[PDB]
């Protein structure tokens, strides 16, 4: 499990700025903090972790002072259109934490040990702003506390409280379709797998015994309801589709895989999704 706190800060000019942030536990969002909002919003019943009301409000105040401060401080460092991204959290195992900062889409600074360092290949004009920043011994101390202690202690509480929503199972639903391959007299078969949780999945094209080596695993694309979509494609020579199947393995299924053969169930499904092919591609 990787726990992330992600901050996004836009500085258009001296008088225009906003910072919205989000928080992930695995592939599930736990927190939202909109620039419109003074308070951090829970996005789950268990987003308070195992902290008490006041214990949470103590931590929230800490962050409230930070956001105002960050905003004013950055605009000063500028003097020595700006996008800044912060990635802070820890990875659970014992644990290991991190604080990475990115400037104009490029990773440039991390908090490491007791102070801010520039990462190799960082632009040298950062040296002054960093020298100024490292002087603030109060910030150094509260950061070390968050990274070394609060984060691990918090996350071990989030996992225990979120046990249920983390272990949940949602079954995949597959369907077939195909398009012209860029190669003459070829077609690309497409196996659509959608609505599964957790993320890990096995999707292959088969000729019964053999896994089709031409099978191309696509990227994981998300669904709005926190489930996943993935498609495996296969480039066949037109006429060779018959005898092929899409096989889907997933933890929600028992041992009972989804096999979809190209050709009755497939016939009715294709008859349900006919169109005029505009504007196809």
């Amino acid at each position: 499990y990787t726990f992330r706190c992600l901050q996004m800060s836009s500085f258009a000019n001296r008088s225009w700025s906003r910072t919205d942030s989000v928080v992930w536990l695995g592939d599930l969002q736990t927190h939202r903090w909109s620039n419109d909002s003074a308070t951090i919003s829970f996005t789950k019943p268990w987003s308070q972790g195992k902290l008490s009301n006041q214990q949470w409000e103590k931590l929230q105040h800490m962050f409230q002072v930070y956001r105002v401060s960050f905003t004013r401080d950055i605009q000063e460092l500028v003097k020595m259109p700006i996008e800044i991204q912060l990635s802070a959290g820890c990875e659970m195992y014992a644990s290991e934490s991190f604080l990475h900062v990115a400037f104009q889409g490029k990773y440039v600074v991390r908090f490491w040990g007791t102070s801010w360092q520039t990462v190799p290949g960082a632009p040298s004009w950062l040296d002054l702003p960093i020298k100024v920043l490292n002087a603030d011994q109060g910030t150094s101390a509260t950061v070390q506390m968050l990274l070394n202690d609060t984060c691990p202690l918090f996350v071990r509480g989030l996992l225990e409280a979120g046990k249920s929503d983390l272990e949940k199972q949602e079954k995949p639903v597959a369907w077939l379709s195909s398009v012209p391959s860029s190669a003459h007299g070829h077609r690309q078969l497409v196996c659509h797998v959608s609505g599964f949780y957790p993320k890990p999945v096995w999707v292959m094209w088969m000729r019964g015994d053999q896994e089709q080596q031409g099978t191309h695993r696509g990227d994981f694309l998300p669904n709005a309801d926190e489930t996943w979509y993935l498609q495996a494609t296969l480039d066949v020579e037109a006429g060779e589709e018959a005898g092929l199947a899409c096989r889907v393995k997933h933890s929600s299924l028992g041992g009972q895989d989804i096999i979809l053969y190209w050709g009755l169930h497939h016939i009715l499904d294709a008859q349900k999704m006919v169109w005029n092919h505009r504007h196809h591609h």
């Epitope: 460092l77 020595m80 002054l128 020298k131 100024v132 002087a135 603030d136 011994q137």
Partner: T-cell receptor, first 113, second 112 residues
Framework: TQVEQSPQSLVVRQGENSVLQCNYS??????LRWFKQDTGKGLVSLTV?????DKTSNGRYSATLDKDAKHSTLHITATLLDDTATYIC?????????????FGAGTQLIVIP | MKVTQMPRYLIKRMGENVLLECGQD?????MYWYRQDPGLGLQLIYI???????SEGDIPKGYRVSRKKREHFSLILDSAKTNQTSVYFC???????????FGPGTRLLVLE
Amino acid sequence: TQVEQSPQSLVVRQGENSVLQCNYSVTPDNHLRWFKQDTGKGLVSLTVLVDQKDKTSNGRYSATLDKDAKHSTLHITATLLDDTATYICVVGDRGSALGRLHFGAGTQLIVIP
Amino acid sequence: MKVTQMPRYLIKRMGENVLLECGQDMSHETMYWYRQDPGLGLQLIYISYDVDSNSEGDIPKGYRVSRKKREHFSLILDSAKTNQTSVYFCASSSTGLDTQYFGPGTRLLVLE
């Protein structure tokens, strides 16, 4: 105005002790500095207070800080005649140069022989 | 050591260039320009974090500033106004939480 000093002026007999108060609204509140300004002169730092409950000393000068009450006291023990000055309380909202420094109006301490 | 500030007294006519100089030998990075007015208190005009790296204080209007060397910090008034009559103080410090050192001041009077 986020820093208030109390009282405005203080008359003490040479050799006695005097007590100066500072209250503030500054947030965040990183540090509190006490300054001494003689007539026609620049400010000279007496002491710097950093902790939540802090106590400092500089010879005859000593100060306390309660960040909860957001309140500081400057104590002058056995006041000399050269202690006749304006005493300035300053709160910083940062632990570095990036910080905004809020300057009080100051207490005038007049020591009489 | 101390903080240098010259001249001590200055009388200028309305709409004249005013250069107020300042110096320190502690090789401090941070330097400040203030003005002190009856009862009102110290108001920051300009700060400097190092060479060629300045930032407007609380009341920058009518004032510009220069710092081409670490040891000096010049306050420039391009055309002086009668409300720019005040006592001007220089100051320096380390980039951290160390002592702040002030100069002796400059009494500037601007007249019609």
